[PDB]
Design a binder for this molecule. Structure first.
Ligand SMILES: Nc1nc2c(ncn2[C@@H]2O[C@H](COP(=O)(O)OP(=O)(O)OP(=O)(O)O)[C@@H](O)[C@H]2O)c(=O)[nH]1
Ligand SMILES: [Mg+2]
Lengths: 208, 170
């Protein structure tokens, strides 16, 4: 399954390119780059890596619009197509900045007061079994240039012990956890045996 | 602000022209590239009907069965539906009855429905005659339009008819 190895290399490449911009603050201000800017930089490097390797035929990167990002609790979606022309996997990726601590609402006027965590969980429930939520943390408290990953199911499992809200649960999970699984070790279950993911256990996903 | 707000949804098989329909109505533009909708999206358009300001929250649903669950959750609170088939594609017209019962199952909030056969600029590739669409719409109790998002035919008329139907039921 070539797509797994090439996409893992793409993820590590994009994160390493993004590390340059992490830990930057404007000269007088405490302001960092916008979350959308970081997400777009990461996505552009990732997609340019998937091109020149010829794997875009089996992988589609869809950046959520502002409306889609607000509704789905996802910042983009990776759809993995199989040997046939059928969808085999979907990763709903939400990014976080934990170097500094709110979701801005759209012009909806009909209701929607949930967290990004609950929205992502509901999105992945609605899509189906082969859709998994994935948090990517750009920078942690200390080590502002550290990029990590956490599967949503791991946080959900930790929530049966912590009994605290999902965002604080992801925050507690990115700390408190030293065991790591490499990104290529993950995603080896791309087009088969979706039980390997969602059963990754108490572990974070390391990029570099 | 505004005087009314109506939730409209656009449903139908994939590659039928739901996004193209929405983009033509909202931005008066068209692009031939096929970017399939992931789950759902929406756009807001303000119109003036019956000397009243009506805002339209128009949701573009995905046509693939894979999203049929998530899309259905957003039928909640919908007041109007654009059920679209493609006159080029017979499978899309055969799927209409299933879409209509899906409307009935998941909203049925006295939601008005409009049946639309898109791509009517593609007369050389038509496989569903106009009479078939008229008959099915008359049976189901829907108003009917053949339209083209490419050439901007009967797009505004379809949306305005939906808005008129919603306004009258009050
Ligand atoms: N000739 C012609 N082509 C059209 C028309 N409307 C859409 N198309 C083309 O048909 C294809 C379907 O476009 P979409 O609007 O994205 O189809 P869709 O209903 O949104 O499909 P999903 O997003 O998967 O649900 C695109 O390649 C368009 O360029 C039309 O009125 N006439
Ligand atoms: Mg679409």
């Amino acid at each position: 399954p070539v797509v797994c190895e090439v996409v893992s290399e793409a993820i590590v490449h994009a994160a390493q390119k993004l590390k340059e911009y992490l830990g930057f603050e404007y000269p007088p201000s405490k302001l960092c780059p916008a979350a959308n800017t970081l997400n777009e930089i990461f996505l552009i490097h990732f997609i340019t890596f998937c091109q020149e390797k010829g794997v875009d035929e089996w992988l589609t990167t869809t950046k959520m619009t502002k409306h889609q990002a607000f509704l789905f609790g996802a910042d983009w979606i990776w759809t993995f197509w199989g040997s046939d022309k059928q969808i085999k996997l979907q990763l709903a990726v939400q990014t976080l900045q934990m170097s500094s601590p709110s979701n801005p609402e759209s012009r909806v006027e009909e209701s929607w007061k949930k967290s990004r965590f609950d929205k992502l969980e509901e999105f992945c429930n609605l899509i189906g079994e082969d859709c998994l939520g994935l948090f990517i943390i750009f920078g942690m408290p200390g080590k502002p240039k550290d990029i990590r990953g956490v599967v949503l199911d791991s946080v959900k499992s930790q929530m049966v012990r912590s009994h605290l809200p999902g965002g604080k649960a992801v925050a507690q999970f990115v700390l408190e956890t030293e065991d790591c699984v490499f990104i290529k070790e993950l995603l080896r279950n791309c087009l088969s045996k979706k039980d390997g993911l969602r059963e990754v256990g108490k572990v974070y996903i390391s990029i570099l | 602000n505004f005087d009314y707000m109506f939730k409209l949804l656009i449903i139908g098989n994939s590659s039928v022209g739901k996004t193209s329909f929405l983009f033509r109505y909202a931005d008066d533009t068209f692009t031939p590239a096929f970017v399939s909708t992931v789950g759902i999206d929406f756009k807001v358009k303000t119109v003036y009907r019956h000397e009243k300001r009506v805002k339209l929250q128009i949701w573009d649903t995905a046509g693939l069965e894979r999203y049929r669950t998530i899309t259905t959750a957003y039928y909640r609170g919908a007041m109007g539906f654009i059920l679209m088939y493609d006159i080029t594609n017979e499978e899309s017209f055969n799927a209409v009855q299933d879409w209509a019962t899906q409307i009935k199952t998941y909203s049925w909030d006295n939601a008005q429905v409009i049946l639309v056969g898109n791509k009517c600029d593609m007369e050389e590739e038509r496989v569903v005659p106009t009479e078939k669409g008229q008959l099915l719409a008359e049976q189901l109790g829907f108003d009917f339009f053949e339209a083209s998002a490419k050439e901007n035919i009967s797009v505004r008329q379809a949306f305005e008819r939906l808005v008129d139907a919603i306004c009258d039921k009050m």
